[PDB]
Design an enzyme around this catalytic site. Structure first.
Site, PDB file in Angstrom:
ATOM      1  N   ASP A  77      -6.779 -50.002  20.134  1.00  0.00           N
ATOM      2  CA  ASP A  77      -6.790 -48.552  20.230  1.00  0.00           C
ATOM      3  C   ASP A  77      -7.132 -47.835  18.923  1.00  0.00           C
ATOM      4  OD1 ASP A  77      -4.376 -46.194  21.656  1.00  0.00           O
ATOM      5  OD2 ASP A  77      -6.434 -45.898  20.931  1.00  0.00           O
ATOM      6  N   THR A  78      -8.384 -47.392  18.824  1.00  0.00           N
ATOM      7  CA  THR A  78      -8.868 -46.659  17.657  1.00  0.00           C
ATOM      8  C   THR A  78      -8.229 -45.290  17.500  1.00  0.00           C
ATOM      9  OG1 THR A  78     -10.785 -45.773  18.859  1.00  0.00           O
ATOM     10  CG2 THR A  78     -11.030 -47.897  17.640  1.00  0.00           C
ATOM     11  N   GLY A  79      -7.607 -44.780  18.563  1.00  0.00           N
ATOM     12  CA  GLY A  79      -6.909 -43.499  18.494  1.00  0.00           C
ATOM     13  C   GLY A  79      -5.457 -43.571  18.030  1.00  0.00           C
TER      14      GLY A  79
HETATM   15  C1  LIG Z   1      -2.751 -38.278  19.106  1.00  0.00           C
HETATM   16  C2  LIG Z   1      -3.912 -39.131  19.543  1.00  0.00           C
HETATM   17  C3  LIG Z   1      -3.582 -40.064  20.718  1.00  0.00           C
HETATM   18  C4  LIG Z   1      -3.266 -39.263  21.983  1.00  0.00           C
HETATM   19  C5  LIG Z   1      -2.487 -41.042  20.298  1.00  0.00           C
HETATM   20  N1  LIG Z   1      -2.175 -42.030  21.365  1.00  0.00           N
HETATM   21  C6  LIG Z   1      -3.117 -43.160  21.410  1.00  0.00           C
HETATM   22  C7  LIG Z   1      -3.977 -43.016  22.665  1.00  0.00           C
HETATM   23  O1  LIG Z   1      -5.088 -43.922  22.618  1.00  0.00           O
HETATM   24  C8  LIG Z   1      -3.217 -43.235  23.965  1.00  0.00           C
HETATM   25  C9  LIG Z   1      -2.828 -44.676  24.285  1.00  0.00           C
HETATM   26  C10 LIG Z   1      -2.068 -44.742  25.602  1.00  0.00           C
HETATM   27  C11 LIG Z   1      -2.621 -45.357  26.721  1.00  0.00           C
HETATM   28  C12 LIG Z   1      -1.936 -45.418  27.923  1.00  0.00           C
HETATM   29  C13 LIG Z   1      -0.677 -44.853  28.020  1.00  0.00           C
HETATM   30  C14 LIG Z   1      -0.112 -44.239  26.925  1.00  0.00           C
HETATM   31  C15 LIG Z   1      -0.801 -44.186  25.713  1.00  0.00           C
HETATM   32  N2  LIG Z   1      -4.074 -42.744  25.018  1.00  0.00           N
HETATM   33  C16 LIG Z   1      -3.853 -41.649  25.731  1.00  0.00           C
HETATM   34  O2  LIG Z   1      -2.937 -40.845  25.658  1.00  0.00           O
HETATM   35  O3  LIG Z   1      -4.877 -41.461  26.715  1.00  0.00           O
HETATM   36  C17 LIG Z   1      -4.691 -40.459  27.701  1.00  0.00           C
HETATM   37  C18 LIG Z   1      -6.087 -39.913  27.940  1.00  0.00           C
HETATM   38  O4  LIG Z   1      -6.666 -40.871  28.822  1.00  0.00           O
HETATM   39  C19 LIG Z   1      -5.658 -41.431  29.648  1.00  0.00           C
HETATM   40  O5  LIG Z   1      -5.804 -42.838  29.648  1.00  0.00           O
HETATM   41  C20 LIG Z   1      -4.696 -43.470  28.997  1.00  0.00           C
HETATM   42  C21 LIG Z   1      -3.593 -42.424  28.973  1.00  0.00           C
HETATM   43  C22 LIG Z   1      -4.317 -41.091  29.025  1.00  0.00           C
HETATM   44  S1  LIG Z   1      -0.619 -42.483  21.372  1.00  0.00           S
HETATM   45  O6  LIG Z   1      -0.472 -43.587  22.261  1.00  0.00           O
HETATM   46  O7  LIG Z   1       0.115 -41.311  21.783  1.00  0.00           O
HETATM   47  C23 LIG Z   1      -0.156 -42.915  19.854  1.00  0.00           C
HETATM   48  C24 LIG Z   1      -0.351 -44.239  19.438  1.00  0.00           C
HETATM   49  C25 LIG Z   1      -0.038 -44.650  18.128  1.00  0.00           C
HETATM   50  C26 LIG Z   1       0.483 -43.766  17.192  1.00  0.00           C
HETATM   51  N3  LIG Z   1       0.840 -43.964  15.880  1.00  0.00           N
HETATM   52  C27 LIG Z   1       1.323 -42.845  15.301  1.00  0.00           C
HETATM   53  S2  LIG Z   1       1.377 -41.445  16.328  1.00  0.00           S
HETATM   54  C28 LIG Z   1       0.701 -42.435  17.563  1.00  0.00           C
HETATM   55  C29 LIG Z   1       0.386 -42.040  18.889  1.00  0.00           C
END
Ligand SMILES: CC[C@H](C)CN(C[C@@H](O)[C@H](Cc1ccccc1)NC(=O)O[C@H]1CO[C@H]2OCC[C@H]21)S(=O)(=O)c1ccc2ncsc2c1
Lengths: 99, 99
Positions: free
Chosen positions: B25-27
């Site tokens: 996860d690059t995000g």
């Molecule tokens: C602030 C930027 C993003 C939203 C951060 N998220 C990583 C993200 O990749 C997350 C990773 C994620 C994936 C699945 C469930 C929960 C989180 N994906 C996510 O929320 O995606 C949403 C949009 O598309 C949908 O598909 C997946 C969920 C929805 S995270 O999981 O909240 C996250 C991860 C590590 C981290 N480290 C410090 S704060 C922090 C926050």
């Protein structure tokens, strides 16, 4: 480009004629942008992240230029902590992970 | 390897002596793993994403193997719905975004 990950992969995007900064987010299925106005029809939807669920407005078939590469697809608008470009558009611009 | 983004970029990781599936996860700034009882000292932390914040336990210098590549660093443990490999470890296994 090739983008390493010692810093957040932030890029400039162009959408509805406006420039914004967004995060390339391979962990996101969907593209979610902070509150903004976009033209045309939208549908209420809900999506879940790490902290629970939010309400978003779903806009379909929206053009969006990401680091100079063209996409046209679904954009969700709602209370995301930051603009995220998810896999629905990352695939359109030919983005892969490599190691 | 090259991982396309048509589907979630889930890979096998090993931590402690458990094998798990996790998102590259690059995000994600940090690595967040589903609840598991790791040995050692830790510090409380709160991390935010879509939906709000979750409370996690921060463990330092934890070895993890990600698709055969060794890494060692900070791992956050808490009630995430998915195991997340964040940038702190993605850099260690040589992971880039390319388009
Ligand atoms: C602030 C930027 C993003 C939203 C951060 N998220 C990583 C993200 O990749 C997350 C990773 C994620 C994936 C699945 C469930 C929960 C989180 N994906 C996510 O929320 O995606 C949403 C949009 O598309 C949908 O598909 C997946 C969920 C929805 S995270 O999981 O909240 C996250 C991860 C590590 C981290 N480290 C410090 S704060 C922090 C926050």
């Amino acid at each position: 480009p090739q983008i390493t990950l010692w810093k957040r992969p932030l890029v400039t995007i162009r959408i509805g004629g406006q420039l914004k900064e967004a995060l390339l987010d391979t962990g996101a299925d969907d593209t979610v942008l902070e509150e903004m106005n976009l033209p045309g029809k939208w549908k209420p939807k809900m999506i879940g992240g790490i902290g629970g669920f939010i309400k978003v407005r779903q806009y379909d078939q929206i053009p969006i230029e990401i680091c100079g590469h063209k996409a046209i697809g679904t954009v969700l608008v709602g209370p995301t902590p930051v603009n995220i470009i998810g896999r629905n558009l990352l695939t359109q611009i030919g983005c892969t992970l490599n190691f």
